[PDB]
Write an enzyme that holds these catalytic residues in place. Structure first.
Site, PDB file in Angstrom:
ATOM      1  N   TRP A   1      -2.904   9.854 -43.659  1.00  0.00           N
ATOM      2  CA  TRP A   1      -3.740   8.695 -44.036  1.00  0.00           C
ATOM      3  C   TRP A   1      -3.043   7.868 -45.129  1.00  0.00           C
ATOM      4  O   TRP A   1      -3.438   6.710 -45.308  1.00  0.00           O
ATOM      5  CB  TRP A   1      -5.140   9.161 -44.479  1.00  0.00           C
ATOM      6  CG  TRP A   1      -5.190   9.715 -45.872  1.00  0.00           C
ATOM      7  CD1 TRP A   1      -4.426  10.713 -46.411  1.00  0.00           C
ATOM      8  CD2 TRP A   1      -6.072   9.291 -46.931  1.00  0.00           C
ATOM      9  NE1 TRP A   1      -4.766  10.906 -47.729  1.00  0.00           N
ATOM     10  CE2 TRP A   1      -5.775  10.066 -48.060  1.00  0.00           C
ATOM     11  CE3 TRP A   1      -7.083   8.335 -47.005  1.00  0.00           C
ATOM     12  CZ2 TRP A   1      -6.462   9.917 -49.262  1.00  0.00           C
ATOM     13  CZ3 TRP A   1      -7.764   8.184 -48.192  1.00  0.00           C
ATOM     14  CH2 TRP A   1      -7.452   8.972 -49.290  1.00  0.00           C
ATOM     15  N   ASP A   2      -2.022   8.405 -45.783  1.00  0.00           N
ATOM     16  CA  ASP A   2      -1.094   7.632 -46.645  1.00  0.00           C
ATOM     17  C   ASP A   2      -0.651   6.353 -45.956  1.00  0.00           C
ATOM     18  O   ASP A   2      -0.498   5.311 -46.620  1.00  0.00           O
ATOM     19  CB  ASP A   2       0.131   8.437 -47.041  1.00  0.00           C
ATOM     20  CG  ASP A   2      -0.200   9.680 -47.833  1.00  0.00           C
ATOM     21  OD1 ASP A   2      -1.169  10.368 -47.472  1.00  0.00           O
ATOM     22  OD2 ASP A   2       0.533   9.955 -48.799  1.00  0.00           O
TER      23      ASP A   2
ATOM     24  N   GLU B   1      -8.993  16.740 -52.745  1.00  0.00           N
ATOM     25  CA  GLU B   1      -8.682  17.966 -51.972  1.00  0.00           C
ATOM     26  C   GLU B   1      -8.974  19.232 -52.773  1.00  0.00           C
ATOM     27  O   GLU B   1      -8.978  20.312 -52.207  1.00  0.00           O
ATOM     28  CB  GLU B   1      -7.229  18.019 -51.522  1.00  0.00           C
ATOM     29  CG  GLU B   1      -6.887  16.959 -50.491  1.00  0.00           C
ATOM     30  CD  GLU B   1      -5.484  17.130 -49.932  1.00  0.00           C
ATOM     31  OE1 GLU B   1      -4.701  17.895 -50.545  1.00  0.00           O
ATOM     32  OE2 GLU B   1      -5.185  16.552 -48.837  1.00  0.00           O
TER      33      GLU B   1
ATOM     34  N   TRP C   1      -4.589  15.810 -39.517  1.00  0.00           N
ATOM     35  CA  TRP C   1      -4.326  15.599 -40.958  1.00  0.00           C
ATOM     36  C   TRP C   1      -2.860  15.214 -41.121  1.00  0.00           C
ATOM     37  O   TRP C   1      -2.529  14.291 -41.876  1.00  0.00           O
ATOM     38  CB  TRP C   1      -4.708  16.829 -41.787  1.00  0.00           C
ATOM     39  CG  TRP C   1      -4.449  16.538 -43.238  1.00  0.00           C
ATOM     40  CD1 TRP C   1      -3.522  17.092 -44.063  1.00  0.00           C
ATOM     41  CD2 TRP C   1      -5.099  15.517 -43.999  1.00  0.00           C
ATOM     42  NE1 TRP C   1      -3.550  16.478 -45.286  1.00  0.00           N
ATOM     43  CE2 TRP C   1      -4.475  15.483 -45.260  1.00  0.00           C
ATOM     44  CE3 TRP C   1      -6.112  14.599 -43.726  1.00  0.00           C
ATOM     45  CZ2 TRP C   1      -4.867  14.612 -46.265  1.00  0.00           C
ATOM     46  CZ3 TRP C   1      -6.499  13.722 -44.717  1.00  0.00           C
ATOM     47  CH2 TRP C   1      -5.855  13.714 -45.959  1.00  0.00           C
ATOM     48  N   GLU C   2      -1.968  15.928 -40.445  1.00  0.00           N
ATOM     49  CA  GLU C   2      -0.526  15.590 -40.485  1.00  0.00           C
ATOM     50  C   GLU C   2       0.017  15.435 -39.075  1.00  0.00           C
ATOM     51  O   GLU C   2      -0.206  16.318 -38.227  1.00  0.00           O
ATOM     52  CB  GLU C   2       0.274  16.669 -41.216  1.00  0.00           C
ATOM     53  CG  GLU C   2      -0.042  16.776 -42.685  1.00  0.00           C
ATOM     54  CD  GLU C   2       0.711  17.851 -43.425  1.00  0.00           C
ATOM     55  OE1 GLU C   2       1.841  18.173 -43.055  1.00  0.00           O
ATOM     56  OE2 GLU C   2       0.173  18.298 -44.466  1.00  0.00           O
TER      57      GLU C   2
ATOM     58  N   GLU D   1       5.632  11.464 -57.020  1.00  0.00           N
ATOM     59  CA  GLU D   1       4.248  11.661 -56.550  1.00  0.00           C
ATOM     60  C   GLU D   1       3.262  11.741 -57.717  1.00  0.00           C
ATOM     61  O   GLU D   1       2.201  11.110 -57.617  1.00  0.00           O
ATOM     62  CB  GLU D   1       4.221  12.918 -55.691  1.00  0.00           C
ATOM     63  CG  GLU D   1       2.862  13.249 -55.123  1.00  0.00           C
ATOM     64  CD  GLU D   1       2.921  14.526 -54.313  1.00  0.00           C
ATOM     65  OE1 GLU D   1       3.989  15.188 -54.314  1.00  0.00           O
ATOM     66  OE2 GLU D   1       1.911  14.859 -53.675  1.00  0.00           O
TER      67      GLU D   1
HETATM   68  O1  LIG Z   1       1.454  19.851 -46.294  1.00  0.00           O
HETATM   69  C1  LIG Z   1       0.417  20.739 -46.637  1.00  0.00           C
HETATM   70  C2  LIG Z   1      -0.534  20.189 -47.709  1.00  0.00           C
HETATM   71  O2  LIG Z   1       0.244  20.074 -48.889  1.00  0.00           O
HETATM   72  C3  LIG Z   1      -0.682  19.849 -49.987  1.00  0.00           C
HETATM   73  O3  LIG Z   1       0.142  19.809 -51.139  1.00  0.00           O
HETATM   74  C4  LIG Z   1      -1.357  18.527 -49.796  1.00  0.00           C
HETATM   75  O4  LIG Z   1      -2.295  18.361 -50.899  1.00  0.00           O
HETATM   76  C5  LIG Z   1      -2.097  18.477 -48.476  1.00  0.00           C
HETATM   77  O5  LIG Z   1      -2.591  17.175 -48.175  1.00  0.00           O
HETATM   78  C6  LIG Z   1      -1.120  18.840 -47.369  1.00  0.00           C
HETATM   79  O6  LIG Z   1      -1.822  18.908 -46.119  1.00  0.00           O
HETATM   80  O1  LIG Z   2       0.797  12.390 -49.821  1.00  0.00           O
HETATM   81  C1  LIG Z   2       0.311  13.416 -48.943  1.00  0.00           C
HETATM   82  C2  LIG Z   2      -0.956  14.076 -49.370  1.00  0.00           C
HETATM   83  O2  LIG Z   2      -0.716  14.559 -50.705  1.00  0.00           O
HETATM   84  C3  LIG Z   2      -1.821  15.183 -51.286  1.00  0.00           C
HETATM   85  O3  LIG Z   2      -1.384  15.380 -52.636  1.00  0.00           O
HETATM   86  C4  LIG Z   2      -3.068  14.301 -51.406  1.00  0.00           C
HETATM   87  O4  LIG Z   2      -4.162  15.069 -51.879  1.00  0.00           O
HETATM   88  C5  LIG Z   2      -3.359  13.719 -50.022  1.00  0.00           C
HETATM   89  O5  LIG Z   2      -4.377  12.690 -50.126  1.00  0.00           O
HETATM   90  C6  LIG Z   2      -2.112  13.085 -49.441  1.00  0.00           C
HETATM   91  O6  LIG Z   2      -2.353  12.623 -48.076  1.00  0.00           O
HETATM   92  O1  LIG Z   3      -2.685  19.412 -57.724  1.00  0.00           O
HETATM   93  C1  LIG Z   3      -1.603  19.715 -56.819  1.00  0.00           C
HETATM   94  C2  LIG Z   3      -2.113  20.741 -55.824  1.00  0.00           C
HETATM   95  O2  LIG Z   3      -3.218  20.145 -55.129  1.00  0.00           O
HETATM   96  C3  LIG Z   3      -3.772  20.944 -54.082  1.00  0.00           C
HETATM   97  O3  LIG Z   3      -4.808  20.194 -53.456  1.00  0.00           O
HETATM   98  C4  LIG Z   3      -2.702  21.298 -53.028  1.00  0.00           C
HETATM   99  O4  LIG Z   3      -3.267  22.160 -52.045  1.00  0.00           O
HETATM  100  C5  LIG Z   3      -1.531  21.992 -53.692  1.00  0.00           C
HETATM  101  O5  LIG Z   3      -0.531  22.158 -52.658  1.00  0.00           O
HETATM  102  C6  LIG Z   3      -1.002  21.143 -54.844  1.00  0.00           C
HETATM  103  O6  LIG Z   3       0.023  21.856 -55.560  1.00  0.00           O
END
Ligand SMILES: OC[C@H]1O[C@@H](O)[C@H](O)[C@@H](O)[C@@H]1O
Ligand SMILES: OC[C@H]1O[C@@H](O)[C@H](O)[C@@H](O)[C@@H]1O
Ligand SMILES: OC[C@H]1O[C@@H](O)[C@H](O)[C@@H](O)[C@@H]1O
Ligand SMILES: OC[C@H]1O[C@@H](O)[C@H](O)[C@@H](O)[C@@H]1O
Ligand SMILES: OC[C@H]1O[C@@H](O)[C@H](O)[C@@H](O)[C@@H]1O
Ligand SMILES: OC[C@H]1O[C@@H](O)[C@H](O)[C@@H](O)[C@@H]1O
Lengths: 659, 320, 320
Positions: free
Chosen positions: A321-322, A450, A369-370, A594
């Site tokens: 969704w980015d 999340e 989601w991905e 990020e």
């Molecule tokens: O790639 C696996 C997951 O990595 C986490 O760090 C992100 O927050 C999720 O959005 C992502 O689905």
């Molecule tokens: O950038 C990829 C993913 O990263 C995660 O840190 C965020 O929570 C998601 O919203 C985002 O889609």
């Molecule tokens: O705050 C960063 C963390 O957010 C969580 O939502 C993700 O699942 C982790 O992969 C990430 O390291």
């Protein structure tokens, strides 16, 4: 270091250096602090199982530009050059290195991901001598450890006019899923009879090279070019022959014609631009954001960027969704043909979304989601987002409808928009549960925040379902179709709850937890479900201190900035604009990580959000629910004397804002 | 820094650091400046086409000792430890790291290429607390980029007396010439009923890990060991089963019997020695030379050292 | 034996027994006369060259529900149980076995081909003990002889709230045409802190298992569920990850939410029904005919049944 078009680094420091990217939406080349080398090369659309996540990933590819230069047998290194500088020209995506070698010569090298030829790269090397010298030039094709079963070839393509020496490698991604071919040649000014003889060496299992010697008298310029083509079986059935064919093509087109076409396409991209008077640093920063989105996308394709574009393997090159919510909106306003490619990516993957829906017990299309090649779910299984973060389906619907609102393309709506909107609405109609009070719930999701996992009635998720059902119903009307009346009945009764203080509740278990990123505030922008300025402000007041400083991505403060601009609060809008990306910068080119203090650039998602804060916030530009681009009340930062935004909407309008 | 038996480094500097080797003539382990990691592992007698020369080469192998340690959820790193020291004891080929973590604990780790068991490695970790803390311990088996077609396994070997959790990987050298197997276990003092539960994670294509938590009250010592076996089809026809069999064997021999046999063989090697009076630096330098030749050779074999022994891939591990 | 909704079997006779099928149009599970076992599992849409006809065929698949139950170390056997009964509930496609172990406990087990989740199966096990006892439970994933090149994995999926232990196998159909993945978990009522530790054994080339012990006190019920997902490359490009993702999804939906959705979809199917007054045997027989057609088809798909539906390999699974 405040050139509005150029990012410069004096004496690259390898102990504290984050490379910059040149890209054409197909190949990305990330810079090395070392002269005449590149750190990483990424090819879009090529995924295999590799390292992170146990799922499909981008693969580090051939560092195809790597060259060794020697002067009278002495190897050019970081340690024996002086006045070494690197520069990214954002006008044409040229990365240039320049240095002095002792008392012998000045060297300049410029490389390009050719904008018009998705699979072709070129580097031009200029040597300006202060004394007689002999150069030895080697181009190395090292098979990266990410690839296997390589073959290293070399041949001469000849006719009465040319000798094109081709240095070619063919190799496979880890599971054998994709065959990669790379083919390089040297292009000389002086012609077949006078050009240097090219030697080929195959001394290692994973490296071969082509090389030549050239005597250069003092006070002369000697220039040559390296042209490479890089392509896979994901792009063409016969990459080996297509790579050689492309490099032969490019060699016989020649450097001038290649660079002229490159320049013309970059000139066209920059017809949509953002000019700030009174803040040279902001002007350069915003140009860098536009440059990266332009480099990481491609009109007239079905390509969609990962959160890190082509700057590396961030998030395995997956599409999230980015794109729809973060990178898509600024591109839709500046270059609707870029946004068209982004939603084409999803249209092409509608059948995979239908398959996901059926596997998880729902109707219609459930976007993953991905996403990667197939459009099936690609999220690592240890991340509960893959199974439970469902708002992505509504995010795709919102982008599809916005594409129609901005372009008014009813033919596109019939062929592509409606298939998406109908299938995603069918998903939500199957996803909701009616309770005893006749309300509709969306139970057991991961929130846009999340950190809230397996909770009920997430504000952002429920809002996306409302918009998806509403927009699908509006789309049916444009096409003269009766939408199922259930879509409106459900949209009108999906739960969005308030806490006792009148603040939008993030989810049914939410009181005062810290949150990862914007969620309830996204109901104000982008969804515009919350329009009451007092409600917008109450929600900003409660949530703006809920996002910690550490480990929180650049998907929050740009929204805060935009919402405060819309509330005509210049000080708060500018505070949040700076906070959105300045704490995330990496030297020496101010690339964006990020998170605050992060070291994983380039986070293209972050740039997309900030560009919305500038265009939709400071510029007040808005996607009108009735169609087209409108302007709402906004403010500029105190120190901005003028904001000029060009190439907006299908009418290519210029907007000028002042105090 | 003129100990005649020990080479010491205060505050390893990763910008200017050349690791030391422990070896038993079969496995070499080269040190990392990072705590509780190793830079490179080399197995004698295993050659395949790889990088330099387009000819047979030693292959970088599993960094099988790599561990992540966290104190109350906080990850131990170079940047958040103090009084960090590394030491090679040339008397018994023990490589030891020691550091302080904030106000919580002192950590010491010692690893060995077991002198009597050509295919077996052991690391012993000691945690001495100054405050109540909870440790999280992870052992990572990352398949190096030199190997392919890996499989990542985990199982419990049990009887009425033991639960031996085995973390196993099997992979292939570049052309498929050689199958490599590695199998690791944690050895605990406290016995089957009280030992920590071991979790297994498979989150990456090229890495799996086993982990546990342990609460340690202030002013206590908690020790555990990591035992690994590393072997190939160049050494045995069935390396997968032989690696697990060896690690089970070593776990039921136990740390004391393993270290006692290790010590006895090193004591025998040092019965041939060179002693210099009046030049402490020359005495240490000559001991280092003897230590490396002893580490890079093995009696009662048909092994011969490369110009770089088991310190890395110098000259592709070829004999000259 | 003229219940209009249920087919019952007292003391199944293995010398004259034809199992019944539960199916959701995607997976069929055919019953065994043996307690806590299934005879055969068939996945729709997965064909390869295999036995009959020298042409494409359905393939016998993982008997993913196979379980061994022991009381104080004594395994449940057909010779040491009594009041053994099996029942098919045609209203919801629940297959239930029930028996008494000696004088100790009553056991019931109900399994389902989940009507809303084409690739997911669940079995719920209830144990009522008349005396204090300890159960050992094992779930076996045996690779059937129809499949090759299997891999046997086990891992823990964790967060602060859950530990989901996944027992996963991946294997290939005879010519390599199709990759099959199966992933199983145990779902417990009592929560992450109190749930039993899950052990993993890999003792055979074609079988691995996960297991636990649980103490139950006199006059108490202990209930747990086994959830499995079964999918192939004919259904999804990445069946290995999709199988684990599905089982994680189902585990976090939970038993109540899964069974409620299952029941809703079966209730909808039975809104079209045939009722006969005056002939209870005809009523039951016609309900069985509707039950099999409803079990062997699926709305909103491009699936078509073979002559034998998902009851086995009849006519190679082909459509006529
Ligand atoms: O790639 C696996 C997951 O990595 C986490 O760090 C992100 O927050 C999720 O959005 C992502 O689905
Ligand atoms: O950038 C990829 C993913 O990263 C995660 O840190 C965020 O929570 C998601 O919203 C985002 O889609
Ligand atoms: O705050 C960063 C963390 O957010 C969580 O939502 C993700 O699942 C982790 O992969 C990430 O390291
Ligand atoms: O090779 C490319 C060149 O070809 C010539 O035939 C054309 O006249 C040039 O305009 C062109 O740049
Ligand atoms: O496990 C190894 C140990 O086994 C015992 O049976 C012996 O008595 C000990 O001497 C030995 O160290
Ligand atoms: O895990 C599934 C459960 O999730 C909860 O958040 C919901 O309130 C329940 O109704 C649902 O059964």
């Amino acid at each position: 270091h405040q050139d509005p078009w150029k990012l410069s680094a004096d004496k690259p420091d390898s102990n504290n250096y984050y490379g910059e990217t040149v890209a054409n939406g197909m190949i990305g080349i990330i810079s090395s602090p070392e002269p005449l080398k590149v750190k990483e090369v990424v090819l879009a659309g090529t995924y295999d199982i590799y390292k992170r996540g146990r799922v499909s990933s981008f693969i580090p590819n051939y560092n195809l530009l790597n060259m060794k230069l020697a002067f009278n047998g002495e190897s050019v290194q970081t340690y024996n050059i002086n006045n070494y500088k690197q520069e990214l020209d954002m006008r044409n995506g040229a990365f240039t290195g320049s240095f002095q070698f002792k008392d012998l010569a000045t060297v300049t090298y410029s490389y390009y991901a050719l904008r018009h030829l998705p699979h072709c790269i070129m580097m031009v090397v200029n040597i300006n001598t202060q004394k007689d010298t002999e150069i030895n030039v080697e181009n190395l094709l090292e098979t990266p450890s990410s690839l296997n079963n390589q073959q290293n070839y070399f041949q001469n393509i000849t006719n009465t006019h040319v000798n094109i020496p081709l240095l070619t490698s063919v190799a496979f991604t880890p599971t054998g899923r994709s065959k990669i071919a790379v083919s390089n040649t040297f292009l000389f000014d002086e012609g077949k009879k006078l050009q240097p003889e090219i030697l080929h060496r195959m001394n290692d299992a994973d490296m071969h090279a082509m090389s030549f010697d050239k005597k250069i008298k003092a006070g002369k310029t000697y220039s040559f070019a390296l042209i490479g083509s890089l392509i896979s079986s994901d792009h063409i059935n016969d990459p080996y022959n297509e790579a050689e064919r492309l490099t032969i093509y490019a060699a016989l087109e020649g450097k001038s014609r290649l660079l002229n076409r490159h320049m013309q396409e970059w000139n066209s991209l920059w017809q949509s631009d953002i000019q700030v008077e009174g803040d040279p640093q902001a002007q350069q920063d915003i140009r860098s954001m536009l440059y990266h989105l332009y480099s990481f996308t491609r009109k007239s394709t079905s390509l969609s960027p990962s959160p890190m574009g082509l700057s590396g393997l961030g998030y395995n090159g997956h599409v999230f969704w980015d794109t729809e919510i973060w990178m898509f909106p600024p591109m839709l306003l500046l270059h609707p043909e870029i946004a068209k490619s982004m939603i084409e990516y999803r249209y092409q993957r509608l059948d995979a979304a239908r398959k996901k829906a059926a596997i998880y017990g729902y109707d219609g299309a459930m976007f993953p989601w991905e996403s990667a090649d197939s459009g099936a779910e690609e999220t690592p299984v240890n991340a509960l987002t893959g199974a439970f973060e469902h708002h992505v389906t509504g995010d795709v619907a919102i982008a599809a409808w916005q594409y129609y609102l901005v372009t008014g393309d009813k033919e596109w709506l019939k062929e592509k928009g409606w298939p998406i909107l109908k299938a995603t609405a069918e998903f939500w109609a199957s996803r909701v549960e009616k309770n005893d009070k006749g309300e509709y719930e969306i139970k057991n999701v991961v929130a846009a925040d999340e950190w809230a996992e397996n909770i009920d009635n997430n504000a952002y998720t429920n809002g996306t379902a409302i918009r998806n059902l509403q927009y699908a119903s509006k789309c049916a009307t444009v096409l003269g179709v009766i939408a199922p009346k259930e879509w409106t009945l459900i949209a009108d009764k999906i739960l969005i709850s308030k806490m006792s203080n009148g603040v939008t509740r993030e989810h049914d278990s939410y009181t005062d937890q810290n949150i990862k990123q914007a969620d309830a505030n996204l109901l104000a922008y982008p969804l515009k479900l919350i329009t009451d300025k007092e409600q917008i402000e109450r929600d900003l007041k409660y949530y703006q201190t809920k996002i910690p400083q550490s480990d929180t991505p650049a998907m929050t403060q740009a929204i805060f900035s935009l919402l405060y601009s819309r509330l005509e609060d210049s000080d708060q809008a500018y505070h949040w604009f700076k906070d959105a990306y300045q704490p995330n910068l990496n030297p020496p080119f101010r690339v964006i990580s990020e998170c605050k203090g992060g070291t994983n650039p380039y986070f293209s998602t972050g740039a997309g959000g900030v560009l919305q804060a500038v265009i939709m916030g400071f510029g007040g530009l808005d996607i009108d629910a009735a169609g087209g681009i409108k302007q709402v009340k906004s403010v500029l930062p105190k120190n901005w004397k003028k904001l000029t935004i060009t190439g907006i909407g299908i009418e290519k309008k210029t907007f000028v804002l002042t105090h």
